[PDB]
Symmetry: C2
């Protein structure tokens, strides 16, 4: 099984090395090994060569069973962008790879039910996933006296995504919140109809319709009501970023993006935090937890996945924190500390231990 | 002698309306002036009592007035049998009707209630912010194979909305957060351009640009940062609704909407709440606080506004709470026991001596 690793820049290279370290450990214990191929992306791909996303690399992803991405973006490329070169990169990966589904899981750790800006009374039990359409809806001269944007969805597109939403619900709490603005948007009338059409092929799953703005109130008022939420390209952008606050440190969260044909790209939701890069103290868990995702959805290796979720779970229950999830004043570990500890947790949950 | 269009509607609309009305009726007496109140049918009560969800007759009356107060619309009766041609949403029929462009949803948390919200007290205690929302532009056959929505913005629409935003920031904390998607949206590339260009006209107001996805985060991680938020139709709808939670309950929240010429419609953000209609448990403060902004914006009467606002602030500081702002097991009051208590706080705040003076 061949894997596409792309650290990028900032702490990208750091949290990537961290992820791969945890990864390697689990596979050597489990029988199989992996071939790793390395590629530039964004700032590193703008420097050492031409485009934010080189052809030279795009194909290495294409010839590989999964992709691990770190981060991109920086000050260096904030002034002197050209608005065609600064970071993403990512779009280009998305469109270049026919990735249609975005999967952002949010399960709050008991360990951590006090990190959020929200009250522990509300965040304690939440474990939900936002499933986001990536191909349709919006997107894909100073002085103009007017501007236009076209929101275009196809019935294929919607159907393709809502199905993933039900597939996932089946492995979870068998409930799908479908979020549309169907009291105003042509595309949303379509969405909700596509929705009820599929509801029928999974009679054992609850489908509810939620208006996009309600959704936003309920994500802070009562995220425990949610299992799976499926939504259109823009909304998903907004709701992901909102739901992300439920847990508090973007440093926890992982994301997967999946292709029409089942190719995967896995990455941490957190940006590049370029200040902190080089001082070995970025929280490696998200990228780590991401490789767990990869394990699950790219290769069906469920146990090798649970192995990490189970590990990470404990290390935090021990009360290990990195900078970001540390209480104020609380003691915190470095990246390799965190890393090495997560390793330790897996070996100990893979034992003999008679006597 | 200044005319007011009054639009109760359904659910608890009339309930809360009648509340807000009394408070208003009082202040005027204490203050000399008096108000004429023409009553109108709207929503379900217009579908029932005369055919159309928004009779032209009423529309005409809103036109011949100086300000509009609306309660709420919606209910099971027309949740089924909608037609999507009359589901008690002539609320839009009013937006376009009198060319409302500016929606204002203020959010300032009473310390009484820093623990009434889903968000931690630490985070929500300072906040006092307005989301200003563009109402005219932007967004807006089973079996079909595809769908399209056009998002249309004209430079005028935007100039106008970014203006009332700065105009407001001046009377507040001189900050404006312009919220767009300038990295993917065409309408937003234009949006920014207009705000940069208007900001030059106000060098004593801070301009910041913020992407919407961020904004959604920032509203819950650090809502204190915000003074004025100005944004587009859809974004503004989502962000409004997200930030509503920061106070906690909707029963606490007023909204105004303005026209080009400056006609005003003040309504509570909270919905029909059909389940508790007639049962005098509804929180009338929002609707009241709305009639307050009405005094401010539609009639320049700043003291009469401050009169209501602080009167309300008191009744909270005291310990009064209705069903929705009560922590559980704590005691709450009825609509009228809420209304009356507020009426009292206007008279004693119109006390004018300190064993002295």
């Amino acid at each position: 099984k061949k894997i596409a690793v792309l650290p990028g820049d900032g702490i990208g290279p750091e949290v990537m090395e961290a992820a791969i370290e945890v990864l390697k450990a689990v596979a050597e214990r489990f029988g199989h090994e992996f071939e790793f191929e390395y590629g530039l992306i964004g700032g590193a791909a703008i420097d050492e060569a031409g485009t934010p996303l080189p052809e030279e690399t795009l194909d290495v992803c294409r010839g590989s069973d999964a992709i691990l991405l770190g981060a991109v973006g920086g000050p260096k490329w904030d002034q002197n962008p050209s608005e065609l070169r600064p970071e993403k990169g990512l779009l280009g990966i998305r469109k270049g790879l026919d990735l249609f589904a975005n999967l952002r899981p949010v399960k709050v750790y008991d360990s951590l039910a006090d990190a959020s800006p929200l009250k522990k009374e509300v965040i304690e039990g939440v474990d939900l996933v936002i499933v986001r359409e990536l191909t349709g809806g919006l997107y894909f001269e100073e002085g103009e006296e007017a501007a236009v944007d076209t929101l275009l969805y196809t019935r294929e597109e919607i159907e393709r995504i809502i199905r993933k939403a039900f597939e996932l619900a089946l492995t979870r709490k068998k409930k799908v919140t479908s979020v549309d603005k169907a009291n105003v948007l042509e595309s949303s009338r379509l969405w909700r109809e596509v929705a009820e059409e599929v509801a029928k092929e999974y009679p054992d799953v609850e489908l509810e319709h939620m208006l996009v703005d309600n959704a936003a109130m309920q994500l802070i008022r009562n995220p425990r009501q949610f299992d799976v939420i499926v939504t259109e390209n823009m909304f998903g952008d907004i709701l992901s970023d909102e739901a992300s606050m439920i847990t508090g440190s973007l440093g926890m969260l992982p994301s997967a993006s999946l292709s029409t044909d089942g190719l995967g790209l896995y990455e941490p939701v957190h940006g590049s935090a370029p200040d902190i890069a080089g001082k070995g103290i970025a929280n490696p868990l998200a990228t780590i937890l991401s490789a767990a995702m990869m394990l699950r959805y790219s290769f069906g290796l469920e146990e090798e996945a649970k192995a990490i979720e189970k590990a990470v779970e404990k290390v935090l229950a021990e009360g290990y924190r990195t900078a970001d999830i540390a209480k104020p004043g609380g003691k915190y570990v470095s990246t390799t500390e965190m890393t090495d500890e997560v390793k330790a947790a897996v070996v100990d949950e893979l034992a003999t231990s008679a006597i």
